[PDB]
């Protein structure tokens, strides 16, 4: 999957990120640990290739 840095998606599975235009990857709402860092909070991984928002960590509410 190719990423066009700093170029809007209208000038070139299409996803728009702050880093640029990402082609060939599908966005998934689920959060995981970062496998391949892309930038601006988006990470990519292979499971086809998916793009997701990286998860900071498991939530733990202390009582």
């Amino acid at each position: 999957a190719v990423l066009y840095q700093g170029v809007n998606c209208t000038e070139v599975n299409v996803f728009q990120t702050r880093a640029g235009c990402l082609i060939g990857a599908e966005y998934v709402n689920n959060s995981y640990e970062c496998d391949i860092p892309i930038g601006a909070g988006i990470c990519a991984s292979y499971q086809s290739i998916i793009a997701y928002t990286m998860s900071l960590g498991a939530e733990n509410s202390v009582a």
Partner: protein
């Protein structure tokens, strides 16, 4: 100074100080061929003769780019669990509104974090269109804010236990008593003066906010980093306008005006000059990256030792005796709020090394012998709390003659009325 005089504080001041440390710089990336030659292909062919300089520059810039994200992750992502503050924001009278996240703000940032963000601020396109690109940070600002909120909630609810293992809850006054025992003052001092300490803490927090708001030079370091980066980029762009020993500084005119045999000479002057400029840019970038990496390591150590625990190192976590710290996020850096214990209102006494009684010398277990002029007592070193000399707080070692400057006095025995009655 004297020979038989000592001074003991009869009060304390809870002071909060700020420390600003840069963490990461702007991630930049260059395109060697586009900068050096632009559209023209003959220049690119000539540029190829000089070897793998462009590859070296690209590799170095990539190294700095990944190092920035590594620095940010090291400084902030120190807890694998994110904690949340309890819904009821009562902690025994202590106020944390100024540092806790504000739900009203869409950015979910504390008021101090918002103030810090606000105080730090066709050139951009001029830089971008020439082959220079800035890259977005991996961690967005809200993610850094979330990390800081998690650390702050952990250090409020659990003290220092969450840093060294599982999180164990502790009521805030009891954590206060633990941290007071850390600096050598007993718990009753805190427990009796809880309201005064809470009021002092709140006043210090308010003063910190006002001081940050009303001083322009407080955040000089981060603004200096931003200015250095922008100035270096602008200087690099300006170098394209220099003739550099050629007849024209624009390559297209040289190509369109002149024959190839001397056109090559002109493009060689331009190529070697632009290579020199690019190498200079890379070398200063590397040096600045090393400096900022050292700063980031210092910030990470400060976080681990002052925020996640109590530190005994002098002046490492603020002026005075250290109590805790609170982290706050800032653009390209982190701001610490060191809470320290400062003695005040000292009062001046007469002291002796040991007390001679029944031919035996008595020495304080943990305190010191003070005398207000007619009577002798034992007090803690860091706070004045007179107490009757007994056998509980004193230990016996040898006779009176060995020590120099011993002073006679009676030693009360707690058991004496017990077996007397």
């Amino acid at each position: 100074y004297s020979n038989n005089s000592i001074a003991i504080p009869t009060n304390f001041t809870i002071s909060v100080t700020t420390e600003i440390l840069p963490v990461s710089m702007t991630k930049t990336s260059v395109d060697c061929t586009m900068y050096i030659c632009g559209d023209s292909t003959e220049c690119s062919n000539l540029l190829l003769q000089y070897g793998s300089f462009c590859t070296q520059l690209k590799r170095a810039l990539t190294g700095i780019a990944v190092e920035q994200d590594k620095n940010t992750q090291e400084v902030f992502a120190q807890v694998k669990q994110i904690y949340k503050t309890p819904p009821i924001k009562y902690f025994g009278g202590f106020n944390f509104s100024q540092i806790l996240p504000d739900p009203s703000k869409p950015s979910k940032r504390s008021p101090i974090e918002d103030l810090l963000f606000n105080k730090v601020t066709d050139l951009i396109c001029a830089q971008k269109f020439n082959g220079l690109t800035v890259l977005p940070p991996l961690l967005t600002d809200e993610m850094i804010a979330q990390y800081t909120s998690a650390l702050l909630a952990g250090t409020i609810t659990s003290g220092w236990t969450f840093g060294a293992g599982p999180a164990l809850q502790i009521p805030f006054p009891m954590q206060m008593a633990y941290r007071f025992n850390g600096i050598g003052v007993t718990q009753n001092v805190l427990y009796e003066n809880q309201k005064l300490i809470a009021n002092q803490f709140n006043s210090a927090i308010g003063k910190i906010q006002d001081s940050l708001s009303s001083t322009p030079s407080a955040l000089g370091k981060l603004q200096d980093v931003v200015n250095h980066n922008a100035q270096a980029l602008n200087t690099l762009v300006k170098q394209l306008s220099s003739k550099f020993g050629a007849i024209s500084s624009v390559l297209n005119d040289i190509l369109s005006r002149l024959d190839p045999p001397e056109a090559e000479v002109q493009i060689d002057r331009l190529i070697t000059g632009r290579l020199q400029s690019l190498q200079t840019y890379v070398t200063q970038q590397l040096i600045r990256a090393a400096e900022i990496r050292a700063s980031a390591n210092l910030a990470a150590t400060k976080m681990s030792e002052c925020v996640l625990g109590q530190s005994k190192r002098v002046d490492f976590c603020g002026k005075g005796y250290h109590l805790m710290s609170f982290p706050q996020s800032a653009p390209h850096g982190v701001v610490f709020l060191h809470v320290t214990y400062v003695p005040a209102q000292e009062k001046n006494f007469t002291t002796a090394p040991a007390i001679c009684h029944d031919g035996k010398a008595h020495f304080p277990r943990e305190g010191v012998f003070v005398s207000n002029g007619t009577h002798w007592f034992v007090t803690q070193r860091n706070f004045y709390e007179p107490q009757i000399i007994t056998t509980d707080n004193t230990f016996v070692s040898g006779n009176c003659d060995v020590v120099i400057g011993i002073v006679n006095n009676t030693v009360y025995d707690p058991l004496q009325p017990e077996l007397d009655s």
